[PDB]
Design a protein around this ligand. Sequence first.
Ligand SMILES: *C(=O)[C@H]([C@@H](C)O)[C@H]1CC(SCCNC=N)=C(C(=O)O)N1
Ligand code: NA
Length: 268
Amino acid sequence: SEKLTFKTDLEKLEREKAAQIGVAIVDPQGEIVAGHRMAQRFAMCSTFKFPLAALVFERIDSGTERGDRKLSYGPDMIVEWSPATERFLASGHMTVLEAAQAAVQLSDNGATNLLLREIGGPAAMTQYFRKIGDSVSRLDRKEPEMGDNTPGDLRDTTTPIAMARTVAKVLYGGALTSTSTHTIERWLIGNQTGDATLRAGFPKDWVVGEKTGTCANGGRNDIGFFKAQERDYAVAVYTTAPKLSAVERDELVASVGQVITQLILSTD
Ligand SMILES: *C(=O)[C@H]([C@@H](C)O)[C@H]1CC(SCCNC=N)=C(C(=O)O)N1
Ligand code: NA
């Protein structure tokens, strides 16, 4: 059984790395391909920035937001890990689209907060999840405190299956116009923060786009999509490994990518 091998190999990683590994792989309609701890809650950390960009694109599509609108700010908006926001600070603004692209591709925290200050805060992010049929994911705080990942805390959490289904809805389920869908996919493919994580464990000819997270208490996450030949999949990986070094956590997620690959290749 290929799925048994998948389970066994993930459990071996968990045992040997003292880790918990949550995975869900779904088809474009949200049908389950495979998973592990798929309905256990994990901190979303920065992975929520992909749904945040989807919310922004939905508003742009609808006309309730404009991509070129300038969002002014001062140094009050700079928080830890805000590389683009810092570079644009002297100019005094970033556009909605600039901020969204920095949030997705650099995991820029200041840019994320700038967009949260606009779209209606964590309450509004959570309402977007509900609107697209995700009753599980919840944002309660802004960056970087939303990544505190206190054990057992249900604030700022999702489950692998809820998030994978949200990704599928956004990319394949008609949440966005064809243009906006294509754009967000290109942003995920061109992500600058994921070279050592999930995509490092996939075949080099798969088209892969993803959004990473790194948070306190050993959280290391990666969500997105992959196309294996003509077959599209949405995937969410959430891991907790407090005893591993940062480099080892990257390698753990890459290893999960390999386990996913073995399953997909072996099931034809
Ligand atoms: C998201 O998961 C966090 C946020 C909670 O702060 C950001 C920070 C990082 S890693 C920090 C070091 N980065 C570059 N030197 C990420 C990430 O995506 O890995 N997201
Ligand atoms: Na200020």
